[PDB]
Amino acid sequence: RFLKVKNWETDVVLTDTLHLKSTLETGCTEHICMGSIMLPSQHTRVRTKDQLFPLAKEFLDQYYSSIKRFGSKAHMDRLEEVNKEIESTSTYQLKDTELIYGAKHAWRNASRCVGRIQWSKLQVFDARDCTTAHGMFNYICNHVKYATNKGNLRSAITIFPQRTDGKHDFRVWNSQLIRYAGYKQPDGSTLGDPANVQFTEICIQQGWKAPRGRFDVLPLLLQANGNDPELFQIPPELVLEVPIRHPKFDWFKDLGLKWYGLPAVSNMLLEIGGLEFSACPFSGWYMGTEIGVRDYCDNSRYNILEEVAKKMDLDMRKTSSLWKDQALVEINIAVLYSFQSDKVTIVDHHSATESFIKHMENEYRCRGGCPADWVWIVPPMSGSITPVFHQEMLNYRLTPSFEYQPDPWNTHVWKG
Amino acid sequence: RFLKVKNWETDVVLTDTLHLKSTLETGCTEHICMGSIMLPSQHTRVRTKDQLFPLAKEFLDQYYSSIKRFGSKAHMDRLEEVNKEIESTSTYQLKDTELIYGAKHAWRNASRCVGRIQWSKLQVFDARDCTTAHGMFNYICNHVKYATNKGNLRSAITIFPQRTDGKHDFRVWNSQLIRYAGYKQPDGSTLGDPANVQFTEICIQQGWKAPRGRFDVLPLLLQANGNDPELFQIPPELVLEVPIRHPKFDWFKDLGLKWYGLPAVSNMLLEIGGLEFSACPFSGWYMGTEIGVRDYCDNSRYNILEEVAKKMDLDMRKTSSLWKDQALVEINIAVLYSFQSDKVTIVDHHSATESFIKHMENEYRCRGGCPADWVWIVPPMSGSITPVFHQEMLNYRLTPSFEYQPDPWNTHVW
Numbered sequence A: 001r002f003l004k005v006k007n008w009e010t011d012v013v014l015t016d017t018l019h020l021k022s023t024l025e026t027g028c029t030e031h032i033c034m035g036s037i038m039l040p041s042q043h044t045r046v047r048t049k050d051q052l053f054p055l056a057k058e059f060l061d062q063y064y065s066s067i068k069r070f071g072s073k074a075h076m077d078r079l080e081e082v083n084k085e086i087e088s089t090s091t092y093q094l095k096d097t098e099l100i101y102g103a104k105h106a107w108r109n110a111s112r113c114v115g116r117i118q119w120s121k122l123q124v125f126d127a128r129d130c131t132t133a134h135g136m137f138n139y140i141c142n143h144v145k146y147a148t149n150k151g152n153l154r155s156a157i158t159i160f161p162q163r164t165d166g167k168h169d170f171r172v173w174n175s176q177l178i179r180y181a182g183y184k185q186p187d188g189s190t191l192g193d194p195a196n197v198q199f200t201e202i203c204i205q206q207g208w209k210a211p212r213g214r215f216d217v218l219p220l221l222l223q224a225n226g227n228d229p230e231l232f233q234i235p236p237e238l239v240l241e242v243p244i245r246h247p248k249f250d251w252f253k254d255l256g257l258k259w260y261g262l263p264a265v266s267n268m269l270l271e272i273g274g275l276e277f278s279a280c281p282f283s284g285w286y287m288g289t290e291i292g293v294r295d296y297c298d299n300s301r302y303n304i305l306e307e308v309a310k311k312m313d314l315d316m317r318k319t320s321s322l323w324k325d326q327a328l329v330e331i332n333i334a335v336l337y338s339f340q341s342d343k344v345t346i347v348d349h350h351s352a353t354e355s356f357i358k359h360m361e362n363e364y365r366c367r368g369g370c371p372a373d374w375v376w377i378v379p380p381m382s383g384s385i386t387p388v389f390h391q392e393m394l395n396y397r398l399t400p401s402f403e404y405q406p407d408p409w410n411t412h413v414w415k416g
Numbered sequence B: 001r002f003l004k005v006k007n008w009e010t011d012v013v014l015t016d017t018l019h020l021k022s023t024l025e026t027g028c029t030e031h032i033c034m035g036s037i038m039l040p041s042q043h044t045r046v047r048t049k050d051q052l053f054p055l056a057k058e059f060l061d062q063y064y065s066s067i068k069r070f071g072s073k074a075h076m077d078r079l080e081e082v083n084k085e086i087e088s089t090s091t092y093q094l095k096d097t098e099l100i101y102g103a104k105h106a107w108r109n110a111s112r113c114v115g116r117i118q119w120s121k122l123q124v125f126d127a128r129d130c131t132t133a134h135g136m137f138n139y140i141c142n143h144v145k146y147a148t149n150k151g152n153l154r155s156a157i158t159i160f161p162q163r164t165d166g167k168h169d170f171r172v173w174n175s176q177l178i179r180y181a182g183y184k185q186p187d188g189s190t191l192g193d194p195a196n197v198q199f200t201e202i203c204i205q206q207g208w209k210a211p212r213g214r215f216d217v218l219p220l221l222l223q224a225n226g227n228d229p230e231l232f233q234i235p236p237e238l239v240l241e242v243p244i245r246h247p248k249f250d251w252f253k254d255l256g257l258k259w260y261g262l263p264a265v266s267n268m269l270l271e272i273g274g275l276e277f278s279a280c281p282f283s284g285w286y287m288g289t290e291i292g293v294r295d296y297c298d299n300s301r302y303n304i305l306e307e308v309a310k311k312m313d314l315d316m317r318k319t320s321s322l323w324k325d326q327a328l329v330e331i332n333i334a335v336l337y338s339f340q341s342d343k344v345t346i347v348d349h350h351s352a353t354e355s356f357i358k359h360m361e362n363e364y365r366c367r368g369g370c371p372a373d374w375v376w377i378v379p380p381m382s383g384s385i386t387p388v389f390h391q392e393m394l395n396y397r398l399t400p401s402f403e404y405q406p407d408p409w410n411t412h413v414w
């Protein structure tokens, strides 16, 4: 059974057979669509040998199909080897080749990711020999150095040991490797990034001396083998930052804004062949709107819309003057211009969405589909003047995958 | 099963139980979400004598509840009466009060409509006594004049006779009552509105003498009782139009842009108690972005971003200058400025989405929920700085409802 999607601006129609290979559930039913639910239980997140071998087998079948060795003796022997390792040891270990395939394909299957044209050019760092928080800090520093590359950013992921009994998890407690602190003041205002107030408090409680500034890089809070997490400060020379200025507005620099260069997600779960990798930080490079639209202008983040609109002297009485929309465009022009001027990799939302359309069409050609989440793919500004807005998309769940997981401070058992 | 929706800007959480009354189907499964498909089979649309009565019963049951007479003398009586009329005539006719209720609730249940906070204020015009296209034209003119109201716009729907056998359908062939024509030029490009090129040709291919301008109001093409349709010119004095100028850039009026004040969808199918109304033009008032973002700036429409940006002298050599975004804002400031200057009702996208959040809150409070289609409720510019962006929405299909329906010229035995 085949399915079609139409781009309504170009009348291009594509045929999806890949959704047939989909196992996991979406969250929708025939009588209700949950397409706009942010964290549906299905997309969030121990396994027993009962269900683990079929998950291994399906993954290995995929893997050996991709290398043109399906049904080969190398393929049959590996299946046998994994089987016996599961029955006697209860889990199994991926080879290096399988881990690299898995991480790439989890990104390939990331239906909310607009940057997936780059998916096969991913640098995979195997940190499965790591045993301690210090060991983790070392692997993460090397990730940040390699990925940053003096501004010429390179996609990378670092993979720490897989979950075993769920009581010895490796976790990076930060949501991203590099993020700014946020501080609730006694008068109710917030200093810094309001998204990080809760995590900032945990760090301070674990002993972090906070500078209490508006752009303080947070410490790494790292958990090895289920032990209590430990604080480490990324060396500042590894944290590339871009001061934000505007190409016409000389007064923009006086807002004292800066942002970091490397977007590196660190709280997600990597699932490959039934195995769960609970610490797997990954990084690419920023699309401009992530910083200029969401980070700076969300009412619940830095929320600089007013300060910018004031200095532009806009009619701020009625909303129908679109002063909000006007300040937003200027802030996003500044973010792009500051990054480009400093030769730090960044992509605008027009370029990135055009690329995704080309990626998606190619994926239908050579793979039979490309799972896509329209709600997340469409940029948070100027939606319809980007070609994804006019593109029908089918959302379904393939593995390997990145999944959400509960914040560790709500599940951790404290040693003391 | 008693589901929850969170707003992530405010942490407000609403519980939805209304969805458990949903009847029709979404197109999704638990294996694949179709939330971005524009027209699944379900959203498009005779009855056997059997499937008609359960539909009638469900509608009457919710009608009599809304008036607090569920399980009353009048309820069971009407129920029996509709039962008997169906056994005999194999259809039935709605009472005036039921027709009004059914129309307001088709709008109440339209999950892609952001303007639904106004749903109970709708003016319903019963046109079920109509028999000819000339009469149809008369009802539509009266609709237009009433809804326009000298620029103080008012919501209205006009309901033509319901389908009987499918051979005698009433249909308005225009997609909206008021739309601008579109002509294909000798040199490949398109003059006027490209969305209307086929329909603009059908009118000519029917007898319309086009002035071949850029903003030529289309004639009405009205089909009564399954007959061949007929052309009709809407009196100009009834078509309120707004010249578009900018409150800062005097060169903006030189661009020669105008738009019409009345958005009046005329090609949808209204379904009440299983009865199908194939001609039910309805109208409200515009949200600014429908014109300024989509109508003006869609690449497959008027596509004027190239010109506005040049006249703004912006660096159009790199997308990373965001010149499209910058021009897009100015256009949409102009549209709002022009309408508000000429005292024609219009709402900006910030106001409408704020009102929709308030409408959701009301519906969750007094009704138990509110079907909502995020892909359509979030405006096509400045998405995340409107409160609907951060709003989780549950999409499900309730009835009475508006459904899409095939274009008549593909169906009619001409």
Ligand code: HEM
Residues within 6 Å of the ligand: A103, A107, A110, A112, A113, A114, A115, A116, A118, A122, A155, A156, A157, A282, A283, A284, A285, A286, A287, A290, A347, A352, A376, A402
């Ligand atoms: C190379 C440049 C990349 C760009 C421009 C990019 C862009 C984006 C954007 C804008 C989002 C939406 C997130 C939001 O708005 O909050 C997203 C989501 C996502 N990205 Fe990419 N990304 C890139 C690389 C990567 C890499 C290297 C990985 C993993 C190896 C990845 C995995 C994901 C995933 C899993 C999501 C979904 C998050 C969720 O389900 O909530 N991305 N990406």
Ligand code: HEM
Residues within 6 Å of the ligand: B107, B110, B112, B113, B114, B115, B116, B118, B122, B155, B156, B157, B282, B283, B284, B285, B286, B287, B290, B347, B352, B376, B402
């Ligand atoms: C009074 C002010 C109104 C406003 C501001 C408004 C706004 C909107 C907007 C912006 C859309 C998105 C469609 C698009 O972008 O093309 C929409 C869809 C819709 N509106 Fe409303 N509308 C109003 C009145 C009405 C009325 C009076 C009715 C019927 C009684 C109605 C029924 C609908 C329906 C059925 C749809 C969606 C069609 C579909 O399912 O694809 N609206 N509306």
Ligand SMILES: CN(C)CCc1cc(F)c(F)c(CCc2cccc(N)n2)c1
Residues within 6 Å of the ligand: A115, A263, A264, A265, A268, A282, A283, A284, A285, A286, A287, A290
């Ligand atoms: C709930 N909300 C905070 C989710 C934020 C979030 C969660 C994720 F898992 C995720 F991969 C991304 C994408 C961020 C990103 C990664 C790589 C490159 C890039 N340019 N951007 C963003």
Ligand SMILES: CN(C)CCc1cc(F)c(F)c(CCc2cccc(N)n2)c1
Residues within 6 Å of the ligand: B038, B115, B263, B264, B265, B268, B282, B283, B284, B285, B286, B287, B290
């Ligand atoms: C995909 N597209 C071709 C569908 C067009 C379409 C179909 C509809 F039923 C519909 F109600 C509207 C909204 C137009 C409208 C109606 C009332 C007020 C307003 N401000 N605007 C637009």
Ligand SMILES: C[C@H](O)[C@H](O)[C@H]1CNc2nc(N)[nH]c(=O)c2N1
Residues within 6 Å of the ligand: A036, A037, A038, A375, A376, A377, B008, B389, B390, B391, B392, B393
């Ligand atoms: C409620 C809604 O699902 C939520 O606000 C989503 C909408 N789309 C998004 N799209 C992206 N890219 N990133 C986001 O964080 C969100 N948030």
Ligand SMILES: C[C@H](O)[C@H](O)[C@H]1CNc2nc(N)[nH]c(=O)c2N1
Residues within 6 Å of the ligand: A008, A389, A390, A391, A392, A393, B036, B037, B038, B375, B376, B377
């Ligand atoms: C492909 C996609 O479903 C299509 O572009 C939809 C998206 N959202 C929309 N939203 C509104 N309000 N109007 C539209 O026409 C559309 N088109």
Ligand SMILES: [Zn+2]
Residues within 6 Å of the ligand: A028, A032, A033, A034, A035, B028, B032, B033, B034, B035
């Ligand atoms: Zn769905």
